[PDB]
């Protein structure tokens, strides 16, 4: 059907834009699954074959393949791609590097301060990319079966500028991302500190008192014995025995943590192995091998079936019986492969397979291991320095990660190690993190690196508390996006050119992205201007009307604009007609919220579908009529916000309402915003009064712009121009 | 020297002076071709302006009205009339803001800050329009000078400056469309009245004369060498001048010492974007600020 | 093949050639080398290199004038108007270059791809191509057209049916864009039915614009085969004809001309170009043709254009080039009066210098003497001849040191460091005398250029 043999090579047409090419010298072609590819059962498409004595030609509706026989070389195997847009070079050569690729992720995090060299993905501005299947053969149960018979295997993606379809077909080829649990979408706390049980409980109670919600408690390697290891054994980083000096009753500690409704994870360091001093060591000794005369059994070889069974039943077993939910695998090693397979990949695969018995749709913490790692969330990065350059780089890295299917990155919120202190840097970093896939605050072993909100002054502390509350307010939206991603394969964080691929400005703004399908985020990653007391960012607005998510400031159609925000504010925008669901009680810990606020931005029709574990709520906004319907019976109450004014509060059941007679406008007006902006600027008073009086007196917009064009300070010019453009 | 002479042409007395040095000659042919041609053109314009100057002279001797007046003589109750020192009124019809600073090498254009009172103003030479009360930075090449006339102004000019005549044999009347216009040309033994009411232009003479009259409405010639006092209707003619945004923008971008891709991008985007606000927003993002100001002046003229 | 130490090694890495001019596959010899041990006798080394690899053929006289080239959508009447404007302004021209817009570009069928390849006249812009070429020849201009063979002879071409009868008829419904320049029959069809009617219309020579990354099919670079066979074919149209192509390694000097292009419009490119042109003689490539005015990118500067053109007038080939932009015109009347007059004067001087250039051409073809030579060809034993990169000898009578730096605004004059060997030298234009061996910083206005001739 869609299989073609020619010379020593085979060609498969998986779809009209994806083509598999196999070359094997011996003569047998691979058929079983690999580390990367998990399924090849696609549909059937139309294609043509032209056969000569020594050459073959493949016709597809978008790609034209030429093979001249023999070994693969840019002279023998090559292709042409036909797309509506034009390009300087539209011909793909084997082995020849092509330009225009939009990049992907990196295996190891290696940036010194700012940008790092990224690896290629499956998206290109030219329209084609090549993914090499360099992995190792996988069995039908999930075991390595050695090297593949095929010498080389390639997958040509020729989707042009339809990136969403390319991502969907990539997920079809390699397997969809599994669902994440709800608790993973809250705030994570992690500090590398020598915590005691009572001190940890006191810290949690302090967090509760300060009105900061948390979902996951992360306990680092100090949970086990470190300095009590005998002299014979080496690094005490590996440990599976509770430190009874710090944790007299681990069971009661975990019970208290669950009583506060927190999910508990522990750091694991399997690199050394199961030594003889471990409390569960005797049991493992009965399973793997008893010591001959006087020895130990730290045989960390994750290839053996029996070792994996003992490690998943007798080492992790009692700890998970105490109440540990999931495991943080911190394997900081340089790929010490024993059987030609990276041990981190095997750890991730088998640990994620094992974690499913503890909870439904469980997760792990581990590191990226190349294509195909998206099936085992989550993957964290860490190892970033605490500087403005890292904050500048991170949004671009997170948004570009979607080009290779890795959509659940978990960065270190606060930075990791080295760096310099700046409270504003921390606040900006956290503002970015709240609108990131995973919000995990991390601190190291230093009294100067605490990320607690009360460690700063009043303004910074209040801003951090507000944003931490907003993260838990946004949980239903994140969970619905999670379900959509697991079902259809839609990334939560997307680059601008996923929605606007035909426009050049969508490629000129790296740190701007789409958060879900309703909000557009452009974080501020530069230090505040001391004169204006405001940071700035360059934002591109596509066609239509956009409103600031927090203040309601209006923005017009396609335009590039420099916007200014104070350190306590963030640029987040929603277009007219957007519908946002929010939790009304973020502080309360409920598996499903008891009441939901619907925020509606007037201007056009709107549509949202809130997906839950066992429910589906439909929200329509058509012709000024807002309708909420439910698939199943529920006791949830609904509150409606139209612009900024409350419409109905704690309304019960599915309903409909008319909003034609209400006030479409928000609370934003030009005069108050102008006064606030002039009030915090460090300029002369006479200048402030002159600007305020003249901008109040002049009526025409053109003459207002002409008046502000004469000012000698240019950042003030830009701020006033943004204000005038909003109020046109 | 060129800027100094441009100021001098629109001054009370134009007297070129040189000292005992072969390096201080003020002759036009002592410079390169461009400077020499500009000097010759302005020296001819000075003699073209003689009837206007003589009428202002007679008015000054009769009633006591200064030929060159500060801005606050006509607009005494407005603060901006006290904040522009080098801007003045030349006679009763023209406003002059000479450029007295060195050219910007990047733009190849000098600049000056000009305050425009209420009404519509046109550049005396190019016809570029300017709106009501506004402060604007305007840019001119070394061969151009900022001189403005408000809508309805009537200017008499000598048609043959090279010919030396005690009284000109023919006079050109330049009319700026937009409002009613008034002028009274005083001579040694004559008085010519020029009216522009409701689109009707009338020239009358107190005494008999053989002078011919040519009419310029905007930039287009209306009637050439008309004889005797007459009346004419200008309602159906073209009020607009020859100035348009596209040619001026191309000329300004053509002489700037910037990268070519920037020039093509600016030209294409300003041709493509329709709304004025979004054009100003597009030019606000440019990193070079003097180019920003020049483009803003062009956009404000073409609003 | 030149060295201050005295020896160099040239590696024969090419492919075996037959007695008729066809590739015969890889050589039996594993490695082949040529050791040149001429010391500091560079002229003799160049003569022996030309003896070994073949002398450079003569160039026609019209190639030594001014070339005009603009990537614009010209119409026949507009092109004739531009030529008449050039005549009115007293600017002589020798060659008219018509870029790729001479053929169909935007009216290619949607099926076919890049319409860069074309062999059909655009009748909307050129209703009567024969009459247009006749008018151009009536103004005594040699005409060349841009050619893009990369795609091939598609079915929509006007001469496509004829080629279809020669190479292969379409089976049921196909085309014949089989651009494989190795087959004898394909080359015959391309040189008889494709270029044939156009050369009958009056096209003199062909501009081969092959912008590809050496996609070799039989182990031979296609550009070399194109140059060889195109130059062999151009000889029937005119006696000692030429082509426009690109450099293809040692041995390309037998097929003039080769252009460079792709230079940015900046002062650094002007600083580099004289050294590149003079150093090209060390490998036998003595007929470079640079893009006069720059090619792409860069910033505007009228002084940069004037200096660049002043260098170009005293270069092997003077070819003014402009791109698809209304801001990149190289016409003299696009500038102010002083720059325009200087450009007109230098363009007239280029045609004044034609007999000297033709005599140097004949000398180069006969004995093998480069027109543009480095200083150390005539003064090999003096250190200063190795310390002045942009100074060279133009023919055998003149020494040129172009100014490649921006003018000093205080003095209103640019400057250049010039080394004068023993004897008396005079400025070619003003007659200012200069004494014997000395290093001197000389200053010239933007309308003047440093060119020197020794006494006698």
Numbering used by the authors:
A (entry chain B): 12 to 739
B (entry chain D): 437 to 739
C (entry chain A): 133 to 588
The publication says:
Within this cluster, we showed that a GH31_u1 protein from Lactococcus lactis (LlGH31_u1) and its fungal homolog demonstrated hydrolytic activities against nigerose [α-D-Glcp-(1→3)-D-Glc]. The kcat/Km values of LlGH31_u1 against kojibiose and maltose were 13% and 2.1% of that against nigerose, indicating that LlGH31_u1 has a higher specificity to the α-1,3 linkage of nigerose than other characterized GH31 enzymes, including eukaryotic enzymes. Furthermore, the three-dimensional structures of LlGH31_u1 determined using X-ray crystallography and cryogenic electron microscopy revealed that LlGH31_u1 forms a hexamer and has a C-terminal domain comprising four α-helices, suggesting that it contributes to hexamerization. Finally, crystal structures in complex with nigerooligosaccharides and kojibiose along with mutational analysis revealed the active site residues involved in substrate recognition in this enzyme. This study reports the first structure of a bacterial GH31 α-1,3-glucosidase and provides new insight into the substrate specificity of GH31 enzymes and the physiological functions of bacterial and fungal GH31_u1 members.
We determined the cryo-EM structure of LlGH31_u1 at 2.73 Å resolution using single-particle analysis. The cryo-EM structure revealed the hexameric state of LlGH31_u1, and the overall cryo-EM structure was similar to the crystal structure (5 A and B). The Cα root-mean-square deviation between the cryo-EM and crystal structures is 1.340 Å. In both the cryo-EM and crystal structures, most amino acid residues at the hexamer interface were identical. The cryo-EM maps for the side chains of the amino acid residues in the C-terminal α-helix domain were well resolved, and most of their conformations were almost identical to those in the crystal structure. At the C-terminal α-helix domain, Val716 and Phe732 hydrophobically interact, and Gln728 forms a hydrogen bond with Lys720. By contrast, the local resolutions of insert 1 and insert 2 on A-domain and a loop containing Tyr99 on N-domain (discussed below) are lower than those of the other regions, and the cryo-EM map of these side chains is unclear. Furthermore, slight structural differences between the crystal and cryo-EM structures were observed. Although the insertion regions are determined with low B factors in the crystal structure (the average B-factor values of insert 1 and insert 2 were 30.2 Å2 and 33.5 Å2, respectively, and those of the other structural components was 33.7 Å2), the structural difference may suggest insert 1 and insert 2 flexibility without the crystal packing effect. However, the cryo-EM structure suggested the flexibility of this residue, and this tyrosine residue is not strictly conserved among LlGH31_u1 homologs, including CmGH31_u1.
